[PDB]
């Protein structure tokens, strides 16, 4: 008279299938990308242009000597 099945206490667990979490898609991407990339080239032309100014100063000390 000592046998298994309980009178109660059950679930069940699902048979389902779901993890579609979105996700920042669909014109949200391709907009943060271009907005990041244009910040890069804007951070250029303030350094590459400025290094071009110090470049001429480096040639300047050459030319003021050599006679």
């Amino acid at each position: 008279k000592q046998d298994m099945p309980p009178v109660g206490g059950y679930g069940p667990i699902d048979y389902k299938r779901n993890l579609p979490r979105r996700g920042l898609s669909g014109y949200s991407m391709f907009a943060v990308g271009i907005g990041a990339l244009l910040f890069g080239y804007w951070s250029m032309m303030k350094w590459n242009r400025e290094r071009r100014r110090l470049q001429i100063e480096d040639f300047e000390a050459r030319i003021a000597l050599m006679p």
Partner: protein, 59 residues
Amino acid sequence: TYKYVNLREPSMDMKSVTDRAAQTLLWTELIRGLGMTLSYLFREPATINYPFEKGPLSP
């Protein structure tokens, strides 16, 4: 009875193609897919330390 799996056409409109062309080109899969599901290393490893610890059995 039945069940049909992988029997569905794409939507094929203007909206959801950009949802799929963000996938192939800028990888919204394959990082959200398996740069996160793997790590997930932060669980405790389950190794029986054999010369000292031993495993369960039954009478």
